[PDB]
Design a protein around this ligand. Structure first.
Ligand SMILES: [Mg+2]
Length: 744
């Protein structure tokens, strides 16, 4: 039992190493410390200052330099006694201030202990290196163990959700959010790997194989290299792991959101297009290439702009194999696989189209090779395509007339065509996969939500508002949930707001919110970004307290989010909301001779949204559904945190980290918690550590509750500082630290 074997890898990688003795005596010391800012030029940079003296109202402590400063007791961030250094649950700390919290996280992280609880949360910090704690062996240790019985681990919360599902006969949810590169997806894959094991139908598994093989498929199409993550997820997802009344995996379903279709036509420097592009180009057989008119990435416009065409220690060729492999296992037919690859190719071809002017103002195609190539793989008619691109027929009321798009207009159209194809192909992929895994007759499920937390970038656009909108709802969801659970707890032992405004500003109907005004402008073909922003400011500037019209910028506005103020840029929102594609383009492709292509343009479930609804309306709608589902589950929350902005191990940056804990609900949670009775200990537990503090008690006593009172009494503790619970002694902030600080 590696849990009891101090030499196992379990101990080594997941636990603070334990010595011989456990005696209270060991950690004894007369020094009392404080957390301070070496200078407010910072604020998250703190240093330990030892209290050299104090007054009835404040503390005097020396700095690192040996400089004596003074602080108000009421403004002091006292340091927890060394015993608390490394605890598995932040809720275990007596002094619960920010620096303290970071400290505990740091201490653990300096031992490569990437996982820590914080009350209801599991906090996970990316190590940025490998930690072999995800073996089958590792899997085996977490089986059926209580949270309190084992080290913190993604496997632990996975086991807890699984058991609750079986014990309560209630669906479950795991929300894993945070910053790009934080490790959401990796953790999400662990969750599934664990479930697949503890609930998979042994012997050897197939359904399970299919399930496992799904991600790989999706990652190839929805993940790309960005400056923040080599394997960034460019879409959000909710994974539903389906179980039967017996607790055996019976299927799964996937819901995808917000795919960055734009990445197909443009990538920042150093970044890469979607993995598959590279996979195909590298892995395709010298024969398939010829049939696909494939060349190197350099020879393609959509792959030769960022300067990066490969990932460090990544074989696109070998990845391709993996990718086809999965396709094979899920069930994609060889034909289907071709068309997909054909779509991939054709897209590349479309991007290699060069529109030229001259003649007049209207676009022309001197060379048609690219066009020919894309038409062949797509299996459409080049002439129709050509026309559809440069001369779409447009309705001017009663008049349906073909226009002569200029180059720019022509090009954007091509781009629109490419993005429509990519996104629909993605949608189709998901649907196919679901057809194979999904069960219309599940008993229970565990859903995993792997999506980014709030996004606060240099530049924030429509997509950011969206994800930011989702996060307001998720955070509100946590808050409500934290409310009920804390209430229960206090009630089982015998003891004793804010997000809607932001949400309403965004999705309200009457008065109309941001999204509603967006939609309204959306009907007007001639509306512009300016008409739009004016409208916005016109309804909220100085009117809505969550809204801010910029001092000078004419294209932005801010919203006060849970995380803080975010400044948004309006450019192209109108276009994003409609996501237009020239009708003739639809017509061209509707006649495709390709079997997959036909589906993308002929299946209303794939070729359209909802007369039809806007992109905003659909986002709202899909978010409501999502929330509805979650509502019906018992949720579990995982906060993946990025130690720094450089993808470096052993480099935990206080400011980077702290800003993440600020925005993700962790510090709030603590603040709230710290205000009541943060520390809640089991009687026996308490006595077992402190018995020697009172001339009365023996380590293991039968009347633990009485024994507790004894010490307390002995120590003459302030009655309002604690609360006798049915099975726990509840302590207010700092109390337990002091007690700890008591002499034997
Ligand atoms: Mg991801």
């Amino acid at each position: 039992n590696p849990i009891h074997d101090r030499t196992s890898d379990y101990h080594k990688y997941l636990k603070v190493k334990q010595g011989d003795s456990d005696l209270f005596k060991l950690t004894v010391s007369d020094k009392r410390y404080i957390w301070y800012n070496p200078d407010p030029k910072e604020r998250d940079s703190y240093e330990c200052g030892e209290i050299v003296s104090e007054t009835s109202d404040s503390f005097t402590f020396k700095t690192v330099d040996g400089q004596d400063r003074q602080v108000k007791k009421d403004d002091a961030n006292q340091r927890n006694p060394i015993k608390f250094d490394g605890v598995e649950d932040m809720s275990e700390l007596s002094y619960l201030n920010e620096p303290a919290v970071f400290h505990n996280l740091r201490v653990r992280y300096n031992q490569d202990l990437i996982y820590t609880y914080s009350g209801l949360f599991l906090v996970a910090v990316n190590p940025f290196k490998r930690i072999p704690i995800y073996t089958q062996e590792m899997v085996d240790i977490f089986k059926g163990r209580r949270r309190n019985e084992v080290a913190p681990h993604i496997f632990a919360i996975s086991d807890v959700a699984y058991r609750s599902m079986l014990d309560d006969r209630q669906n479950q949810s795991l929300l894993i959010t945070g910053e790009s590169g934080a490790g959401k997806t990796e953790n999400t894959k662990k969750v599934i790997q664990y479930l697949a094991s503890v609930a998979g139908r042994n012997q050897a598994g197939v359904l399970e194989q299919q399930i496992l093989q799904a991600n790989p498929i999706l990652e190839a199409f929805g993940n790309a290299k960005t400056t923040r993550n080599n394997n960034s997820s460019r879409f959000g997802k909710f994974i539903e792991i389906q179980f039967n009344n017996a607790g055996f995996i019976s299927g799964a379903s996937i819901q995808s959101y917000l795919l960055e279709k734009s990445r197909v036509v443009f990538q920042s420097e150093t970044e890469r297009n979607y993995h598959i592009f590279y996979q195909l180009l590298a892995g395709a057989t010298a024969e398939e290439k010829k049939a696909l008119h494939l060349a190197g990435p350099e020879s393609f416009n959509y792959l030769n702009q960022s300067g990066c065409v490969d990932i460090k220690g990544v074989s696109d060729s070998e990845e391709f194999k993996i990718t086809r492999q999965a396709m094979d296992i899920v069930g994609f037919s060889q034909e289907e696989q071709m068309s997909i690859f054909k779509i991939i190719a054709g897209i590349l071809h479309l991007g290699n189209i060069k529109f030229e002017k001259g003649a007049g103002e209207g676009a022309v195609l001197k060379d048609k090779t690219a066009l020919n190539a894309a038409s062949t793989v797509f299996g459409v008619n080049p002439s129709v395509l050509e026309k559809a691109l440069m001369e779409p027929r447009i309705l001017a009321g009663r008049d349906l007339v073909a226009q002569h798009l200029n180059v720019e207009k022509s090009s954007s159209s091509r781009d629109a065509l490419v993005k429509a194809l990519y996104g629909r192909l993605f949608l189709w992929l998901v649907k196919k996969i679901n057809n194979v895994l999904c069960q219309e007759r599940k008993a229970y499920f565990i859903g995993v939500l792997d999506i980014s937390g709030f996004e606060i970038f240099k530049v924030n656009s429509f997509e950011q508002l969206c994800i930011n909108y989702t996060n307001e709802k998720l955070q509100q969801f946590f808050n409500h949930h934290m409310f009920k659970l804390e209430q229960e707890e206090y009630l089982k032992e015998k003891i004793n707001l804010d997000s809607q405004a932001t949400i309403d500003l965004i999705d309200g109907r009457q008065p109309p919110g941001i999204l509603a005004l967006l939609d309204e402008q959306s009907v007007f073909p001639n509306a512009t970004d300016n008409t739009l922003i004016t409208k916005l400011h016109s309804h909220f500037s100085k009117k809505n307290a969550k809204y801010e019209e910029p001092r000078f910028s004419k294209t932005e506005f801010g919203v006060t989010h849970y995380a803080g103020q975010v400044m948004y840029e309006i450019q192209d929102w109108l276009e994003k909301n409609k996501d237009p594609l020239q009708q003739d383009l639809e017509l061209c492709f509707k006649d495709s001779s390709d079997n997959v292509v036909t589906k993308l343009f002929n299946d209303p479930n794939i070729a359209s949204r909802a007369n039809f609804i806007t992109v905003a309306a659909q986002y709202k709608e899909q978010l409501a559904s999502l929330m509805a589902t979650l509502e019906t589950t018992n949720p579990h929350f995982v906060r993946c945190i990025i130690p720094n902005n450089k993808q470096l191990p052993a480099k935990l940056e206080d400011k980077v980290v702290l800003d993440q804990l600020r925005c993700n609900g962790v510090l709030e949670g603590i603040r709230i918690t710290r205000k009541g009775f943060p520390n809640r200990i089991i009687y026996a537990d308490f006595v077992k550590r402190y018995y020697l503090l009172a001339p009365n008690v023996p380590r293991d006593a039968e009347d633990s509750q009485k024994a507790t009172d004894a010490v307390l009494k002995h120590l003459n503790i302030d009655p309002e500082q604690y609360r006798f619970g049915i099975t726990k002694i509840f302590f207010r902030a700092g109390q337990l630290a002091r007690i700890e600080e008591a002499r034997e």
